[PDB]
Amino acid sequence: KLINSQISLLIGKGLDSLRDPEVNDFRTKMRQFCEEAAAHRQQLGWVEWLQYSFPLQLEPALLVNVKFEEESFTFQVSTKDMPLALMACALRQPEEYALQVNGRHEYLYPLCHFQYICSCLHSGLTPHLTMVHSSSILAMRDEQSNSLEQPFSIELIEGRKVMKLVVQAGLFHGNEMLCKTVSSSEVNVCSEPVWKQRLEFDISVCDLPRMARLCFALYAVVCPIAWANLMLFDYKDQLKTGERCLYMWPSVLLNPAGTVRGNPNTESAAALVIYLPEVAPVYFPALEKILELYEHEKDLVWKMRHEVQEHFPEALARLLLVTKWNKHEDVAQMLYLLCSWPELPVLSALELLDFSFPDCYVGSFAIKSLRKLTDDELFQYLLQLVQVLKYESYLDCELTKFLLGRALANRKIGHFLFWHLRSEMHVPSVALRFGLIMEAYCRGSTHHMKVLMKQGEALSKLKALNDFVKVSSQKTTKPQTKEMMHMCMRQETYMEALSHLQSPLDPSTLLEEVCVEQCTFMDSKMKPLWIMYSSEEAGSAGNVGIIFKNGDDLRQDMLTLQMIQLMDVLWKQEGLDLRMTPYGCLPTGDRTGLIEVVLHSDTIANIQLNAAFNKDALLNWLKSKNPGEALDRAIEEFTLSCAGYCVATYVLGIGDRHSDNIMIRESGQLFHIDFGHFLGNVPFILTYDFVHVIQQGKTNNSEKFERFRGYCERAYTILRRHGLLFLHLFALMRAAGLPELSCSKDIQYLKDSLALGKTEEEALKHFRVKFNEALRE
Numbered sequence: 001k002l003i004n005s006q007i008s009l010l011i012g013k014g015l016d017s018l019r020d021p022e023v024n025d026f027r028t029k030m031r032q033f034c035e036e037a038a039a040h041r042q043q044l045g046w047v048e049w050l051q052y053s054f055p056l057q058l059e060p061a062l063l064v065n066v067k068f069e070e071e072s073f074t075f076q077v078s079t080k081d082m083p084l085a086l087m088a089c090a091l092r093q094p095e096e097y098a099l100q101v102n103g104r105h106e107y108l109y110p111l112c113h114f115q116y117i118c119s120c121l122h123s124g125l126t127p128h129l130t131m132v133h134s135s136s137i138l139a140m141r142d143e144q145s146n147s148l149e150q151p152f153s154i155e156l157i158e159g160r161k162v163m164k165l166v167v168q169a170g171l172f173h174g175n176e177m178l179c180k181t182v183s184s185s186e187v188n189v190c191s192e193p194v195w196k197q198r199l200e201f202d203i204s205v206c207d208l209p210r211m212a213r214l215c216f217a218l219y220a221v222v223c224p225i226a227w228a229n230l231m232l233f234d235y236k237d238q239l240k241t242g243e244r245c246l247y248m249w250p251s252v253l254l255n256p257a258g259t260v261r262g263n264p265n266t267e268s269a270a271a272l273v274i275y276l277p278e279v280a281p282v283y284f285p286a287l288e289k290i291l292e293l294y295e296h297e298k299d300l301v302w303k304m305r306h307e308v309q310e311h312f313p314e315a316l317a318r319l320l321l322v323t324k325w326n327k328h329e330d331v332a333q334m335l336y337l338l339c340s341w342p343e344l345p346v347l348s349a350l351e352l353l354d355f356s357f358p359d360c361y362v363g364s365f366a367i368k369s370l371r372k373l374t375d376d377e378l379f380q381y382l383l384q385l386v387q388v389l390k391y392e393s394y395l396d397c398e399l400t401k402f403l404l405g406r407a408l409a410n411r412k413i414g415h416f417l418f419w420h421l422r423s424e425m426h427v428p429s430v431a432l433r434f435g436l437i438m439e440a441y442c443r444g445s446t447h448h449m450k451v452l453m454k455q456g457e458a459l460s461k462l463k464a465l466n467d468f469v470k471v472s473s474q475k476t477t478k479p480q481t482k483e484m485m486h487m488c489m490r491q492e493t494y495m496e497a498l499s500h501l502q503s504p505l506d507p508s509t510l511l512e513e514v515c516v517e518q519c520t521f522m523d524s525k526m527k528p529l530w531i532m533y534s535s536e537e538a539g540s541a542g543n544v545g546i547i548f549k550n551g552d553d554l555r556q557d558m559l560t561l562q563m564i565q566l567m568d569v570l571w572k573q574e575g576l577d578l579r580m581t582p583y584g585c586l587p588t589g590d591r592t593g594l595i596e597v598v599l600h601s602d603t604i605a606n607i608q609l610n611a612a613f614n615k616d617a618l619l620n621w622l623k624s625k626n627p628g629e630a631l632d633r634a635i636e637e638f639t640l641s642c643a644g645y646c647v648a649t650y651v652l653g654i655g656d657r658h659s660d661n662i663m664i665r666e667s668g669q670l671f672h673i674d675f676g677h678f679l680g681n682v683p684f685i686l687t688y689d690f691v692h693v694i695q696q697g698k699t700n701n702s703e704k705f706e707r708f709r710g711y712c713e714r715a716y717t718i719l720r721r722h723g724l725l726f727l728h729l730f731a732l733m734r735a736a737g738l739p740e741l742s743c744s745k746d747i748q749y750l751k752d753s754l755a756l757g758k759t760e761e762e763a764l765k766h767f768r769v770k771f772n773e774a775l776r777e
């Protein structure tokens, strides 16, 4: 029971009142499932458990200091040496140990591969680790255990809330209609309106595909009012026969992609009531039955269905787009080949997950092609897979079981699945499904729940704190609310709630002691908070800041930074390190989330605000933080990151860049904050005091500049190869309801910036056109 109450606070809704056997089915089925995984988990070998709880954070001569669970010993080792070898030094049997990063949830392949080690090499800090014996790891593991060929007709009985009242009714597969829409008669505005009018569609009932959905639009004429959709099949495959009442969603005219569950605010939802003509008790045929069984271009793809399977396995997608889905034989045949289809590359499955592949068998097929996804790939695509959950038609689906499975097998997966689900629980459409999934996951780690509660309580006191700061600053100076802010933070409950947590931005980072002294807040607008931490165990890698925002929408920034991080991975996985900074960014709730602070950096504007001439400002700041020899690295740091963000900002169409939202690190790395727009919703950007830095300050030094210009072009064509990768993810993201990612024209921005129609060298001469266009500043 306490566990039940804990799950209810964490996920934000109470745990029944719907007595819906679909919902009851989901919960007990998935709970058995999730408890199975948590059982398996407790029986893993101790290196298998590290892999679960602390997945290694790789990327695609050396001083290092080691202790055991207070005396440390410093060594030198080879950047090429294996953690084993390090341990063996430390011992003077190594296989009985792992290396923990001090004060992080990280354990340690040549050390040149470990994120924490390069985050130390590139930054001169000296790695500090701890030998943790395998007995002691087992302790954690243990501590964390618990036949009918008439036309389909419905009937539109009547309605309930408020010229002339039309209803439009369409039948769709995906966002394709299996026939013609039917409208109603123009009954008069006011009501509670009556229709009692049979609507009959040009489809045989034996020809509704398993995933068919009836879609209504209620509007007003001499203006739209409400929309609503449902499956003609229940979640047990039973064609549904009867009277259903349809609590409608408000509008924008049909909306086949929107949810198949009704508007839950039954107090003000227009209801549309309707009759489903019974027809005999008909369940959609089993799989085994089914297996027994320009337009000229479509016809010659249906055509050699077989040659496509034989010789073009990955063209699956566009054979599924030519398939006549209203014809049940056209579907048995296609669906018959698909049970023999060779598995597909991840890229191709990322296209199949989309909504214009509604059929649940293809969805299964797509999932099956996704079990080979590495955990690092899953993590990169994870946001899209979450948003695709909104397209599903039932609660129990391969997609949900696949995530839960992966979530429960990698704790960093589970961590982020949780926050993605939790962050939308305020959205009517999805609250039930996301709530239900967070619940099954919680019965998979009763331990991780308690860690997440901990994060939630901090996120909760940050909300209160910001609210007091918004109120307090209305009446008071910036410095007077600041010291009030600290007094509130100093209270009892705030110190306890805000301290000793895993960072929701990155669970491997630990937020221990909140440094009240160094907290502050932006005194403009939504009063975003600056919260700083320290940890004596982690040393300097314990000094970490997080920015809290309450008021702003962070979904867009998060997507943009995932994309830049994807870019940097693509680039690093072709040899090219543009030295990017994809900092953490995570919506946690309604207009609420977190930003990872990048320490030791500032804004162009703050740097320009002051040298004799403004162009000297950046270079002199760089000269100041990188003495003598060291400037030279900064200039290359600066130059690569410049090119990388020039390419990134251009592709993603991020305008509105100015000297307050472009930042620079003391290493010389330049990076962008505050995204919020993108897709133009832009020209190549470039600014002579950047040019100035790239040229070592010398008036014009075309031997530096041109190679900088070669960086940009290399990045641009690297990314241009993976343009489909970018197109497919964004396609899935249209499910997010992001306002700048609304329609088709948004995705057609990306198509252009990525010259995706043209050749590799014709796009690069066109890229060359923009780059000089932009240079004249």
Ligand SMILES: Cc1nc2c(-c3nnc[nH]3)cc(-c3ccnc(N)c3F)cc2n1-c1ccnc2c(F)ccc(F)c12
Pocket: 520, 521, 522, 528, 529, 530, 547, 548, 557, 583, 595, 596, 597, 598, 599, 601, 602, 663, 673, 674, 675
């Ligand atoms: C207003 C604002 N937005 C941001 C963003 C950002 N991102 N999306 C959307 N807005 C990112 C970073 C940021 C992020 C990472 N590293 C560093 N250094 C940053 F400045 C800082 C941001 N700021 C801030 C600038 C100055 N002072 C701030 C403060 F006192 C408290 C909180 C603030 F947010 C501050």
